[PDB]
RNA sequence: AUGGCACCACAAGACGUGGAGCGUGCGGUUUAAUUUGACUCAACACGGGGAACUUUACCAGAUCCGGACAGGGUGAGGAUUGACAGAUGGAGUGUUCUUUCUCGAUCCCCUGAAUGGUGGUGCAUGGCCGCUUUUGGUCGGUGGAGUGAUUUGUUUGGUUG
RNA sequence: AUUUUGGGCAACAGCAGGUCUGUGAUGCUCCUCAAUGUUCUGGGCGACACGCGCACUACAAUGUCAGUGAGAACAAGAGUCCGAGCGGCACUUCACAAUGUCGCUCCCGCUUGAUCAAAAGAGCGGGGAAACCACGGAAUCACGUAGACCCACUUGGGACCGAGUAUUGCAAUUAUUGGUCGCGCAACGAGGAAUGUCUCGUAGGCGCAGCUCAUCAAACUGUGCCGAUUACGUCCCUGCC
């Protein structure tokens, strides 16, 4: 066919809730016609953050760090367009940013 | 340079952490972390 | 609109900051939560609140307010969001609306430790595995104090401390001072979905 | 309180936060290499809004609740008849309690 | 490529054992490969195991790896 | 501070308007100086008349006559 | 006492301060200002403090009010906004004024009251955070013991870090 | 192969610590406008007998200089929002100015190819949204090899500074920073009485991310590159149960 090349690229604030994103739609949209290159991932970027905590005036000028991974997964899929379409009928949650693409 | 930043939790320029587009006192960030996702690292 | 951090730095900051607004809004309904769907062509909000009912009702309770609100706040063109009640059963399960009920039974001047000590036993009556509540703020003319109210069991060391409590706080200023009511619910780790086997589970057969 | 900017302004806020019920804003003195902006919620300003509302509010009438920086404006039961007869039409104002699709 | 400059060498060297293995469980039987295993093992610069660090994470507040901050005492 | 902003007195009335009998027929505008346009408070101002110069003091506007 | 235990124990030592020069921080020492907190470990690159103004609290100067809400009076036959040009401004801010035109109650005025306030106390206080103490601990329950406080349990022996 | 690794978490009381310098947590307690409010302006906290506390650097062949080396960590970056820049439009407008609109480029952040210059510096066209895709197939610091110094302040050293150009900023004038070339022999030859930390690819050196950030760190918080005594006990000292 005149397959598309579909990036379904998932980004998500943990690797947790995407997964879950991801492997549904293309289980759904997969059966049949899609036709998806196995899921490749993206660096995980960190968010670093270190804090002067404490008013001590006196007392340990002492400070604290927290930090939010964020992960990426990506499947290509040489798909039908339409039903790409067709299966992206999904309202899907927050903390899972997935952006769906049509190079080749 | 300290006149400009006015923290948008807190009008402030002291008490305020940087950091990436934010704006919050350290309190306030210390407050945060959670709705935000930053987990402790170190 | 944002890059790929921020996406997600915005949506973090959303739902906090929707977080804090209904805490304030929602102290006479018993604010424990907001979840946020977004939608295509609507931002859906479900309302953990225990008052569910009031904060429904008819006329202009709570979400006519607030639709209009959030919308005018947020930056919409009207009617891209939608709240939906949560009945966020069992009411006592929350540390946040008990807290804002023990906020309230202090703003309804009741006695401190006594109305701790009823609520707790209410709390984990409605099943808290347990609660932690303390009374920091003042006593005297004006001196300091503080005292502690728990009941169950606290998670008091790792991360499964962090998974089992949930916390409010809140300060009432009363003939004076600043007075901290600072709760602690722990619910039970029959968590089911929300796991279970936690550090020391180790349970045969 | 004082101001020789008023009735127009006033009107403006009255009537759009009645039509809708509710009004919400960032509190604001307006920045992004700005000029038409006046403040958001409305294209007047928000010094004037601010002002106004002070007054609107500072006697009863009107909620406006926080967090943030931000006031969530909802117009109360007095502020109703108030508006309503402000805003010369019929009793039986609009604001809030419009609620057939909730708002 | 690759900075461990040496830690580069005793990459080479394992990876270079790897390749002699493998390709003589294939291209030989086991008692060459044996005996070409047996000798390198026997002179080896760590085949198998990591170096396992370079360069350590910090300690924050002091910034440093094990030491600290002078303590200024009084 | 004690102050009260400088302005011109106002006291006995406006004098700037001056339609008689026989303006009506011949003449509806009747007033006592020279007009405004380019001001913003519009045809009704008279500028102030002053070195030579018509100003508007609201609309500041610079005329000459 | 005993038995341990630890690289702000020590111990093998290992590198380095100290002296030096530079910095910042500090002390001190001027100012109008030098906002101050905080000084054994647990002040002293800390004060999210990498101060040009700003920051910032402090000085000096100067206008601005954002002086809510009343009560009362004044105010549209005019408060007043605004103002050229100059006069007088740090300053084309009328700040003030001569001059005079705009402008238009949304006024002013008091009499109440009121607030922004980085205006004070952190021994008046939450919260927060430092320190305890980085220490291995802490309980209560019933039961036990004792008049009691109290105590046991929870320890004498081994083992464990 | 040891409570395996570094953390994170972590009891209970306790400490008018500190916490008015967050707080849109605040008692009580002040000013509220001829206020210490607020803006604005302008200053200051950054002022040098000195006493310190950290840091940093030098004093140097173990080095310095000139050059040459096929060394990657770890990890950044393009905001929104209908007179910024640009543009179109609109209308005003004898011409200007004007205003207004709309649109773009969005008040356009990293930035690449590369020309013309002592030099830093000036630039069409490009490119990259956190991008493993452009600034990332190069390019991380002390390595290792060829050349000045036949080890003496050699100038070790640069405090010190003078014109001179570029950039930041509304503003530097309590030199914002760079740049440049001269230019130094300041102190300083490794530091007393004292003294600080530390027992594994790590000490430690060595360097680099990352942000404070208009503009600026020896800070901050990481990254790397390189790369080790004996201690492994003892419980003395000095301290905790």
């Known amino acids: 066919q005149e397959t598309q090349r579909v990036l379904v690229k998932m980004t998500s604030r943990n690797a947790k809730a995407v997964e879950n994103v991801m492997t549904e739609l293309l289980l759904h949209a997969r059966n049949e016609k899609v036709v998806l290159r196995g899921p490749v991932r993206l660096p995980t970027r960190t968010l670093k953050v270190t804090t002067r905590k404490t008013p001590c005036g006196n007392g340990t000028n002492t400070w604290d760090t927290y930090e939010l991974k964020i992960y990426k997964r990506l499947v290509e899929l040489r798909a039908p367009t339409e039903l790409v379409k067709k299966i992206t009928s999904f309202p899907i949650d927050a903390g899972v940013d997935v952006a769906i693409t049509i190079p080749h | 340079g300290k006149g400009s930043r006015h923290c948008v939790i807190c009008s402030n320029q002291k008490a305020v952490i940087r950091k990436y587009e934010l704006n919050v006192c350290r309190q306030c960030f210390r407050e945060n972390a959670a709705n935000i996702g930053f987990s402790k690292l170190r | 609109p944002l890059s790929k951090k921020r996406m997600m730095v915005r949506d973090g900051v959303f739902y906090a900051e929707l977080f804090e607004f209904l805490k304030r809004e929602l102290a006479d309904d018993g604010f424990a ?85 009823g609520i ?86 | 309180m004082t101001t020789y900017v008023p009735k127009s302004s006033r009107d403006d806020v009255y009537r759009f936060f009645f039509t809708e019920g509710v009004v919400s804003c960032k509190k604001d003195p307006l920045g992004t290499w700005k000029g038409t902006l006046g403040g958001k919620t409305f294209k ?21 609740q926080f967090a943030w920086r931000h006031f969530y404006w909802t117009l109360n039961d007095e502020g109703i008849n108030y508006m309503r007869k402000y805003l010369y039409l019929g009793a039986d104002a609009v604001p809030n309690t419009h609620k057939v699709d909730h708002k | 490529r690759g900075s461990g400059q040496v830690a580069q060498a005793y990459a080479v060297r394992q990876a270079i054992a790897k390749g002699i293995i493998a390709y ?47 303590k200024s005492y009084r | 501070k004690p102050i009260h902003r400088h302005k011109l007195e106002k006291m006995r009335a406006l004098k700037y308007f001056k339609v008689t009998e026989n303006d009506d ?27 030579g110069r018509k100003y508007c003091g609201k609309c500041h506007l610079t005329y000459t006559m």
């Open chain 5, 24 to 70: 003589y469980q294939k291209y030989h039987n086991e008692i060459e490969k044996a005996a070409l295993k047996d000798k390198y093992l026997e002179y080896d610069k760590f085949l198998l195991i990591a170096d396992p660090r370079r360069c350590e994470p910090k300690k924050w507040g002091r910034h440093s790896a094990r030491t600290r901050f002078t």
């Open chain 3, 33 to 117: 939560g907001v979840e946020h769907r977004v939608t295509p062509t609507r931002t859906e909000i479900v309302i953990r609140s225990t008052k569910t009912r009031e904060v429904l009702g008819e006329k202009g309770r709570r979400i006519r307010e607030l639709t209009a609100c959030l919308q005018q706040r947020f930056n919409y063109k009207e009617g891209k969001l939608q709240l939906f009640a949560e009945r966020v059963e069992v009411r006592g399960l929350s540390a946040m609306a008990q807290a804002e009920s023990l906020r309230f039974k202090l703003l309804s001047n009741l006695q401190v430790r006594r109305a701790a000590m």
């Open chain 6, 25 to 51: 027929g011949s003449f509806k505008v009747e007033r006592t100086r020279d007009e405004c346009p380019n001001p913003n408070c519009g045809a009704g101002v008279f500028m102030a008349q002053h070195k």
């Open chain 4, 44 to 64: 007047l300003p928000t010094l004037q809004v601010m002002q106004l509302m002070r007054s609107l509010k500072s006697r009863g009438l009107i909620k406006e």
């Open chain 3, 120 to 205: 707790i036993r209410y709390v984990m009556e409605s099943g808290a595995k347990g609660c932690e509540v303390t009374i920091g703020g003042k006593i005297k003319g004006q001196r300091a104090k503080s005292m502690t109210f728990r009941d169950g069991y606290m998670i008091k060391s790792g991360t499964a401390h962090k998974h089992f409590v949930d916390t409010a706080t809140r300060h009432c200023h009363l003939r004076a001072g600043t007075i901290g009511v600072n709760v602690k619910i722990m619910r039970p780790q029959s968590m089911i979905e929300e796991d279970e086997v936690l550090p020391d589970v180790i349970t045969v057969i």
